[PDB]
C-alpha cells in the first residue's frame, strides 16, 4: 500500500502442502516494512529466476 508517501509492506511466510490452489484458511499480516518515498506508482511487475 502507499498512503501519504508511505509505502507499507505487510507480510507472512507459511509452510504449506498444496499443489495448484490457494489454501482455505485465515492468516493475519504483521506490519513489517514502511518506506517514506513519496511517488505515484501505477504499474508493477514481478521478476523470476
Amino acid at each position: 500500500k502507499n498512503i501519504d508517501g508511505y509505502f507499507k509492506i505487510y507480510s507472512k511466510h507459511t509452510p504449506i502442502n498444496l499443489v495448484r490452489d490457494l489454501p482455505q484458511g485465515f492468516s493475519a499480516l504483521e506490519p513489517l516494512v514502511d518506506l517514506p518515498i513519496g511517488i505515484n506508482i501505477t504499474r508493477f511487475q514481478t521478476l523470476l529466476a
Binding site: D4, G5, G38, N40
Partner: protein, 49 residues
C-alpha cells in the same frame, strides 16, 4: 529573509516556481515536469506555441 544570502544584482533567476498547471495538487506532492501548459483550448506541440 534570505536577500543577502543568495540574491544577485542581475536578478536571481535560480529561484523558480510552477505558475501554470491544469489542476490543484494533492498534499505532500511535488512536480518537476516541464511540459508546456496549453493555456488556450488550441492544442499545441513542439517547443512553443
Amino acid at each position: 529573509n534570505s536577500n543577502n544570502l543568495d540574491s544577485k544584482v542581475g536578478g536571481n533567476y535560480n529561484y523558480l516556481y510552477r505558475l501554470f498547471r491544469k489542476s490543484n495538487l494533492k498534499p505532500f506532492e511535488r512536480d518537476i515536469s516541464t511540459e508546456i501548459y496549453q493555456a488556450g483550448s488550441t492544442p499545441c506541440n513542439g517547443v512553443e506555441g
